Design a protein around this ligand. Structure first.
Ligand code: ZN
Ligand code: ZN
Ligand code: ZN
Ligand code: ZN
Lengths: 32, 32, 32
């Protein structure tokens, strides 16, 4: 696994966490 | 294209959408 | 640094900015 492949896998995981965080905040602002 | 090429262009598309959603939510919060 | 490596560098920078924006917006929402 090259450094480039390692970095991409890490980015996939980071972007998944950001998406969940964003989704939660959008719903926190909706305040249903 | 290779898996790495695919993963990188996919990440580019996702982060663009995240940026747009964040832009929108920032504006929404400010306007509330 | 190849093009693919540069795209990954730029994704790293973008995700850092997005994480910061999310942090600030979460704080804004909790404060307001
Ligand atoms: Zn969720
Ligand atoms: Zn949701
Ligand atoms: Zn939900
Ligand atoms: Zn694709």
């Amino acid at each position: 696994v090259s450094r480039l492949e390692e970095d991409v896998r890490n980015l996939n995981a980071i972007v998944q966490k950001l998406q969940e965080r964003l989704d939660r905040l959008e719903e926190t602002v909706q305040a249903k």
